[PDB]
Amino acid sequence: VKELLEAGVHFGHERKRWNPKFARYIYAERNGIHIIDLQKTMEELERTFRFIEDLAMRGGTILFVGTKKQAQDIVRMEAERAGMPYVNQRWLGGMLTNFKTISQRVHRLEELEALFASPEIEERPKKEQVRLKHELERLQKYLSGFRLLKRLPDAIFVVDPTKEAIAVREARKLFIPVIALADTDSDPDLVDYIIPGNDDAIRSIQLILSRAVDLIIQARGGVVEPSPSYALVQE
RNA sequence: GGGGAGCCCUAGCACAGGUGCUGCAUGGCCGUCGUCAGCUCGUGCCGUGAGGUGUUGGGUUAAGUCCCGCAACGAGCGCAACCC
């Protein structure tokens, strides 16, 4: 594992669109692209996985955010393997603040599901049930893994801390351990637990993610196998 | 034999009456923009604050009707809908 498997298919990106201090996490900038100093990546993942396993053996939630299509599908499965609530399709500004309104979005959602199992296949209006199907399906679209997150999650996992600095900014505001990961695109300090590495490599996603997931699984026992991987990665 | 009320009258009397004026005193009714697609609240964010937000962005629809984006997630009177 570690720096070697990382020298297996992924590293640093960003072709000079770089925040200053993320390049303090930089060895060279050859052929245009900066090279992430995976040595300090080992340092980071040390402190990182220290907290990851901390909260894991304690059980205090981590809040998988994924937005870019790639990571997106990927994240869900890993999150669905981890047991942590996530961000599936579209990130919203009412989760990491209006948490209660969205708790009523979940109440609503589960009401819909609870009336899929009610004799509304009998009476009831048909226009009304068209409405039903619509808002049902889209409610699922946004709300999927987040669907089971009551009480605030005391860290996130999250991919690229820039979009998912819309996401960060939220968490960052609320005093919450932004574990979260990207390249020389985002700024350092804004991340709580700074993971320095390419997000543009779907394999980087795969590795960093599933490593962390199976990691908290180890801090809870049961280690199995990373399912989503090399197929979608390159097919 | 005298007086009470139903009662009509003559005088003073309290009084009534006005389709006399002011819609620049008005309710109400209604006409209108015009079936216009608008108007707006909760909570989160943005700004020192007024306030912005949503609802600013693109297709589409009879439509703020529906989908996408998005610092927002909704919700209400209208829209629709139930009445004919």
* Residue A12 tokens, joined: 């640093």
Residue A205 near residue A51 (C-beta atoms within 8 A): no
Claim to verify: residue A126 and residue A20 sit in the same structural domain: no
The whole-angstrom separation of Cα A70 and Cα A209 is 12
What is the C-alpha to C-alpha distance for residues A52 and A145, in angstroms, rounded to an integer?
Answer: 19
Q: Is the CB of A103 under 7 A from strand B?
A: no
Type of residue at A172: R
Half-sphere exposure of A120 (CA within 13 A, CB side): 17
**Of A219, A85, A93, whose CA–CA distance to A153 is shortest?**
A85
Q: Are A33 and A13 in contact (CB under 8 A)?
A: yes
Cα gap A90→A143, rounded to integer Å: 9
Structure tokens at A91: 């990130």
Map residue A36 onto helix, strand or coil: strand
Residue A40, both tokens:
């300090």
CATH code of residue A37: 3.40.50.10490
Rounded CA gap, A161 and A186, in Å? Answer: 6
Q: At what angle do helices A202-218 and A69-82 cross, to 10 degrees?
A: 10
> Tokens for A177?
């351990």
- Domain containing A109 equals 92-147
Residue A17 shares a structural domain with residue A133: no
Instruction: Write out the DSSP string of A170-212.
Output: HHHHTT--BEEEE-TTS-STTSSEEEES-SS-HHHHHHHHHHH
Q: Are residues A27 and A61 in the same domain?
A: yes
Same domain, residue pair A133 and A51: no
- What's the number of CA atoms in the CB half-sphere (13 Å) around residue A156? 32
Q: Which amino acid, A135?
A: E
Rounded distance in angstroms from the CA atom of residue A221 to the C1' atom of nucleotide B69? 42
A164 touches strand B (CB under 7 A): no
Residue A107 to residues A93, A143, A146, A151, A159, Cα–Cα distance (Å): 18, 11, 13, 14, 28
CA of A118 to C1' of B60 (A): 35
Please say whether the beta carbons of A214 and A80 come within 8 A.
no
- Asked whether residue A156 falls in the same domain as residue A227, the answer is yes
Please tell me whether residues A42 and A100 are part of one structural domain.
no
In this structure, which amino acid lies at residue A29? E
The Cα-based distances of A179 to A44, A99, A188 in angstroms read 11, 20, 12
Whether A48 and A59 have beta carbons less than 8 Å apart is answered as no
Domain count, chain A: 2
CA of A22 to C1' of B28 (A): 74
For residue A118, the domain's CATH number is 1.10.287.610
For this PDB entry, the determination method is X-ray
Q: What is the distance between the alpha carbons of residues A62 and A149, in angstroms, rounded to a whole number? A: 10
User: SS3 of A87, please?
Assistant: strand
Residues A164 and A136 in one domain: no
What are the φ and ψ backbone dihedral angles of A21, each rounded to 5 degrees?
-75, -15
Please indicate, yes or no, whether residues A82 and A155 belong to a single structural domain of this protein. Answer: yes
> A215 beta carbon < 7 A from strand B?
no
* Resolution (Å units): 3.5
